[PDB]
């Protein structure tokens, strides 16, 4: 009933703010997005759909404890990866410059057989281990197996706290990722399925 | 006039005609299919999850610019319900779901016809991470249920 | 790494952002 | 348990570009927590007795973590720089929160079952490595030194043994195996005679 | 003289926040410096608009203005404008006067706007190159074994071409390639005058090399050392250098170096080209044990800078010679960069003499600060022959 | 006819620094 | 134990090898090549003592003994084979690590246990094959020879501006600018993923049922023939 109340009152407010100028477009978008709870009302309306939902909930409750253990282990690996890799995922737009104070100005880019002047700007890679939340997100993407060779390359090329990448600087660090793959996607996922 | 090239599939349907000789294969296939037809409401739950996530993605990320060279382009976008469903299926199998997540985060050049100037939010961080959790789990609940 | 729109090889993993789709970063 | 939780909280606040005051506070807290854990371990060992202390499988892990932490501390003192990441493993002791629950027996019997099968798992894990080493050598014989048919050699090559075994592992994880297949086919020569 | 005296009394300040640097940067339409807006009156004897009030500064595109080195260089070179003005006043029929820095910038008078993308570098100019050192007997060894196949071969070809671009008619050059066997890459078989035709032939020959075989440093170095002892042909009888272009090896070849240049009469510059993971130790040892220098060229963007830095090593005996190594030389006829026609340039090197009043530094004072240049148009010479 | 002024192999040359020791 | 040590040393030597393009060789590879006769002789002695203690066609009754015998026979042939045909004969050395499985019976028991579960799966594999073929034929009837048109500038030197298939004035992807949908272009992935015959179709369908790069093929078919009906081929292929 609470669900229904929020999906009814939510639209009400949107109507109240609709008969005027563009007042709080953020709240307008939020209340419009809240409208997606319309199908959920069927869960209790159909006894079979409620039964299958309860079966899903019971299945989740049967494995919540292993879920907690998995989250603790992944948090430990995230902290290890933060210690290993924090600050080392920065780069300069031209590979010749390895420091931020040097990554300033213009540089000659040799693309499409036409040298062109490009700004020299100090950027950071898309997936890094700057803090524990970023490390958790990166390790989740690695666990899914999507683009994990790219983060492996970025981790191998990492040099120091404020330096740019150097190719193949630390190959042994790949052990980390290999160990990760032996634990979470191979072992824990399979014990989830077995449980 | 209206295309009539699907009839060529008919002569390709004779392969099922030789599936009878797999006495062990036929019974296994029939048993699993019959089990699948005995659980339609879990499939309805999965379809409802897809529908809800497609609608949410359509509302939130629908008006991202269709600029190519990114993960939101002329092939993989949130523009329509069918396109949103295809994007969700692509993420469910898992192709570049993290790339699609990165392609819509709070600083995207926004569509020309769109009324807004800043479209795309950091909700994607939740949006894509929960989906990969939910879909998979439901799938894992479906498989065992068969 | 290679910038946006530059020609790349998928197996190099040397695009600064995004992946190397259809031969371009 | 509260000491372990506080240690986990303090080691989990490490992020990039943190204030120097936080760095020094965590540096001193590391020594404080290591000393507290050392004293607790010695007191428990004196009380229960050495054999009784090592009787439990959980105290052996704590002893190993303590000695690894001492090694990491002395290593970092004699050579400031990288961190192995062993003092974070103390967070695994937080798993003892499950003892006061009604799901201790289930969680504890799984580890008793696991530990009873160290021989089989090791044999299975070494048999998987044995087949990954055979396939790496086969790939080295097939595509060894033949991936220079383009601008640059890829990171996914078969020139050295570490590179070949890492390539085989990446193919086993399934990520971008088709790209490696295309590249190897082109190395053996075209779509005509290289399929 | 003024440049040496002014640079001798410098402080090397590390910050330029409140002590702004005021100069007119050419090719313009950053914190640490100010900018000058000139009047640019049209004047004869030049095909462009000029301003006698100050001197213009050219900084190459891939060099950032506002760094500590460039800002210090600008501050200490700001005192050359007075002598530029004095020279112009003492002789009105005077064309460009330029200081070319080893930093990379050129300060020239009178101030004019610079002439697509600009690839001008002062240290690659013929007058700067002739003033930075003495004639040479360059010999280029190219490793053409199997391991250099790919991008580390196109980089080698481009680097060899760019280094051939640094030679003149007074320098003599040859190119050889070795893979378990050393041979000349062309029809020459001995050092040639390194003029336009010979340089074109060598570039065409080096563009045609293919990589296959096994590296053998001893045979290639024996070939290179034997090519420098010909003496049956016209040479420079000056700096004798071997410019090796490899990626990375494992042999130091102590026997060849001990046998041929026992007294270390020949320099060996070594270049490691491409992105690879081979051992660079022997390469650096060979550079260090033969008065040479070791360079790394991992990409196309590093080719231009690394192929011209070897002129810093060749300039040490010139600065150590003293004031006897200060003779005004004149270039060949060449087209002026600022669209002035055919000109010749008078050249005089400038030495770093900070701490030489008490003679105590002697550490970085063995490199030149830059080159003086003054342009004489061929019309000026024609006016003297009615 | 080439130049008669040559400057090389000076005894007081440092030459103790290459491009590998620094890097 | 001495034989197991020899096998481990041989594995370390095989791991120490390095490969270089265009015929280049490291000196360490030359040093390591000299160790082959020692290993071959030791293996021949170890396999020679077992023949005079178990006979033959009972020493050769065991499959592991057969693998050891073929390994040592190929090694002997490679040593005495100066002819040019040794590439397929030098490849047998990659089975040398497997020898240490035959030397540790516990590993043999574990291998038997792990392979005991792959016998029921074989039928499943047959079914899987039946699926792949059944789709490949369909892919042979709709997408055959569709990825060869491309946007070429105006027939100067056959350089396609883009790496995507195009359509000649159709609901497919029209060429942008002043290029034309000309005939013949190898294909998207060096011309490897296509439906030109049954072998290419089988390969691309198998590469598509591993959920690795199937969306790229979907997008190629979309921009080559229109995105109205392509999903109806690929969603079942992923689902089934
Ligand atoms: C396929 C490869 C991938 C495998 C990766 C996953 C490997 C394992 C992954 C998941 C398995 C874990 C499942 C759940 C884990 C913990 C939940 C509860 C389990 C648990 O606590 O049982 C422990 C676990 O031992 C560990 O190793 C402590 C935890 C360390 C386990 C991780 C170690 C790191 C890996 C091993 C490295 C090698 C070392 C072993 O049980 P125990 O033998 O200690 O049992 C005693 C016994 O019950 C005593 O009566 C009890 O004292 P009382 O209360 O006085 O009766 C003891 O407790 P205290 O003395 O502390 O009071 C218990 O600890
Ligand atoms: C002519 O020769 C003289 C000396 O023969 C030379 O004057 C010398 O200039 C250098 C600057 O390059 C001074 O070096 C001081 O000490 C160090 C060394 O660079 C600097 O500290 C940092 O050093 C690192 C290098 O590891 C550098 O990356 C960083 O930028 C430096 N600065 C930081 C971290 O803030 C000092 O900053 C630098 N300057 C000082 C202390 O004022 C020498 O001290 C100078 N020697 C003398 C005797 O004055 C002069 O530059 C030469 N002429 C030209 C045109 O270069
Ligand atoms: C293990 C079991 C496996 C078998 C079961 C699963 C099989 C499912 C897939 C069957 C094939 C579906 C269609 C696949 C191709 C899609 C069509 C396509 O890409 O081409 C579009 C086609 C013509 O394209 P074009 O060449 O551009 O037209 C002429 C140009 N002027 O345009 C058309 O007109 C094409 C029409 C396509 C079909 C229309 C709808 C058919 C409904 C199918 C129901 C299920 C199939 C049952 C039979 C299974 C196979 C025997
Ligand atoms: C056993 C395990 C099972 C696990 C999964 C279970 C849940 C599955 C949930 C659904 C799966 C995803 C479905 C994907 C459908 C995508 C269809 C699509 O992309 O159609 C493209 C095409 C055109 O689409 P649109 O962009 O609207 O066209 C613009 C111009 N008209 O579309 C059309 O032309 C539409 C044609 C009719 C479509 C009817 C539906
Ligand atoms: C390098 O940059 C320096 C700072 O930009 C320049 O140093 C400044 O020069 C000014 C005049 O040349 C000085 O002003 C006067 O200096 C005399 C000298 O003893 C003194 O009377 C006072 O210091 C000052 N008089 C005033 C302010 O009324 C600056 O003091 C002096 N230092 C600064 C500004 O920090 C150098 O000249 C410059 N080098 C070259 C070669 O141009
Ligand atoms: C199911 C499990 C038991 C199999 C997992 C395979 C690992 C044993 C393999 C695959 C990845 C291999 C790693 C891949 C790459 C490297 C780096 C490499 O170290 C180097 O010597 C490289 C240094 C250089 O030559 O520059 C060897 C260790 C390591 C992590 C390898 C160790 C062995 C690893 C961990
Ligand atoms: C094991 C249990 C106790 C979990 C406790 C949570 C913290 C360990 C996590 C969650 C909140 C995280 C913090 C919330 C977000 C950030 C990012 C960041 O905060 C900043 O504002 C600095 C970033 C910048 O300015 O560049 C520093 C780490 C911090 C506060 C995180 C450090 C790790 C924290 C403290
Ligand atoms: C010219 O160079 C050659 C070798 O590059 C010198 O060696 C002699 O070459 C001539 C050619 O027939 C012969 O006299 C001998 O084969 C070589 N040795 C001696 C001792 O003569 C040669 O001395 C150089 N000078 C001349 C004038 O040939
Ligand atoms: C078994 C799990 C749950 C706990 C043990 C996992 C952690 C603590 C271990 C597993 C393998 C270890 C890695 C093995 C090798 C190296 C290379 C070294 O140069 C830096 C540390 C690093 C990267 C280690 C860090 C710690 C590490 C990641
Ligand atoms: C159920 C819960 C966990 C949903 C997740 C809530 C958080 C993660 C989501 C909800 C709405 C999101 C916000 C929606 C819109 C914007 C505007 C954009 O310009 C910056 C990010 C920002 C501010 C988002 C940050 C993340 C956000 C606050
Ligand atoms: C250039 O293209 C046009 C139309 O695309 C064509 O008519 C013309 O013949 C082409 N040019 C040449 C030289 O063929
Ligand atoms: Ca994938
Ligand atoms: Ca070599």
JSON list of C-alpha atoms in Angstrom, two decimals, chain E residues 134-135 170 237-239 264-265 267 284 287-288 293-294 316-318 320-321 325 327 366, chain F residues 1-21 23:
[
{"chain": "E", "resi": 134, "resn": "UNK", "atom": "CA", "xyz": [83.02, 21.28, -36.21]},
{"chain": "E", "resi": 135, "resn": "UNK", "atom": "CA", "xyz": [82.71, 19.18, -39.40]},
{"chain": "E", "resi": 170, "resn": "UNK", "atom": "CA", "xyz": [81.55, 20.01, -44.91]},
{"chain": "E", "resi": 237, "resn": "UNK", "atom": "CA", "xyz": [89.79, 14.75, -41.00]},
{"chain": "E", "resi": 238, "resn": "UNK", "atom": "CA", "xyz": [87.72, 15.91, -38.02]},
{"chain": "E", "resi": 239, "resn": "UNK", "atom": "CA", "xyz": [85.15, 14.42, -35.60]},
{"chain": "E", "resi": 264, "resn": "UNK", "atom": "CA", "xyz": [89.20, 6.25, -27.68]},
{"chain": "E", "resi": 265, "resn": "UNK", "atom": "CA", "xyz": [89.79, 8.47, -30.70]},
{"chain": "E", "resi": 267, "resn": "UNK", "atom": "CA", "xyz": [83.00, 8.56, -30.45]},
{"chain": "E", "resi": 284, "resn": "UNK", "atom": "CA", "xyz": [74.57, 2.42, -22.64]},
{"chain": "E", "resi": 287, "resn": "UNK", "atom": "CA", "xyz": [77.92, 4.84, -25.38]},
{"chain": "E", "resi": 288, "resn": "UNK", "atom": "CA", "xyz": [79.75, 5.56, -22.11]},
{"chain": "E", "resi": 293, "resn": "UNK", "atom": "CA", "xyz": [75.93, 9.30, -25.67]},
{"chain": "E", "resi": 294, "resn": "UNK", "atom": "CA", "xyz": [72.85, 7.09, -25.34]},
{"chain": "E", "resi": 316, "resn": "UNK", "atom": "CA", "xyz": [82.72, 20.14, -25.74]},
{"chain": "E", "resi": 317, "resn": "UNK", "atom": "CA", "xyz": [86.19, 20.44, -27.38]},
{"chain": "E", "resi": 318, "resn": "UNK", "atom": "CA", "xyz": [85.07, 23.71, -28.97]},
{"chain": "E", "resi": 320, "resn": "UNK", "atom": "CA", "xyz": [87.22, 23.90, -23.99]},
{"chain": "E", "resi": 321, "resn": "UNK", "atom": "CA", "xyz": [89.36, 25.48, -26.72]},
{"chain": "E", "resi": 325, "resn": "UNK", "atom": "CA", "xyz": [87.21, 28.73, -31.02]},
{"chain": "E", "resi": 327, "resn": "UNK", "atom": "CA", "xyz": [85.53, 32.54, -35.72]},
{"chain": "E", "resi": 366, "resn": "UNK", "atom": "CA", "xyz": [81.10, 22.78, -21.27]},
{"chain": "F", "resi": 1, "resn": "UNK", "atom": "CA", "xyz": [89.11, 22.62, -49.96]},
{"chain": "F", "resi": 2, "resn": "UNK", "atom": "CA", "xyz": [87.86, 21.93, -46.45]},
{"chain": "F", "resi": 3, "resn": "UNK", "atom": "CA", "xyz": [88.21, 23.98, -43.27]},
{"chain": "F", "resi": 4, "resn": "UNK", "atom": "CA", "xyz": [91.57, 23.81, -41.52]},
{"chain": "F", "resi": 5, "resn": "UNK", "atom": "CA", "xyz": [90.11, 24.31, -38.02]},
{"chain": "F", "resi": 6, "resn": "UNK", "atom": "CA", "xyz": [89.20, 21.12, -36.14]},
{"chain": "F", "resi": 7, "resn": "UNK", "atom": "CA", "xyz": [88.14, 20.82, -32.50]},
{"chain": "F", "resi": 8, "resn": "UNK", "atom": "CA", "xyz": [88.03, 17.31, -31.04]},
{"chain": "F", "resi": 9, "resn": "UNK", "atom": "CA", "xyz": [89.57, 14.92, -28.48]},
{"chain": "F", "resi": 10, "resn": "UNK", "atom": "CA", "xyz": [90.23, 17.63, -25.91]},
{"chain": "F", "resi": 11, "resn": "UNK", "atom": "CA", "xyz": [92.04, 16.25, -22.87]},
{"chain": "F", "resi": 12, "resn": "UNK", "atom": "CA", "xyz": [89.94, 18.15, -20.30]},
{"chain": "F", "resi": 13, "resn": "UNK", "atom": "CA", "xyz": [86.62, 16.76, -21.59]},
{"chain": "F", "resi": 14, "resn": "UNK", "atom": "CA", "xyz": [84.33, 15.46, -18.84]},
{"chain": "F", "resi": 15, "resn": "UNK", "atom": "CA", "xyz": [82.40, 12.83, -20.87]},
{"chain": "F", "resi": 16, "resn": "UNK", "atom": "CA", "xyz": [81.40, 11.16, -17.57]},
{"chain": "F", "resi": 17, "resn": "UNK", "atom": "CA", "xyz": [77.67, 11.51, -18.33]},
{"chain": "F", "resi": 18, "resn": "UNK", "atom": "CA", "xyz": [75.68, 9.52, -20.89]},
{"chain": "F", "resi": 19, "resn": "UNK", "atom": "CA", "xyz": [71.96, 9.28, -21.52]},
{"chain": "F", "resi": 20, "resn": "UNK", "atom": "CA", "xyz": [71.61, 6.06, -19.54]},
{"chain": "F", "resi": 21, "resn": "UNK", "atom": "CA", "xyz": [73.04, 6.94, -16.13]},
{"chain": "F", "resi": 23, "resn": "UNK", "atom": "CA", "xyz": [67.69, 7.61, -17.09]}
]
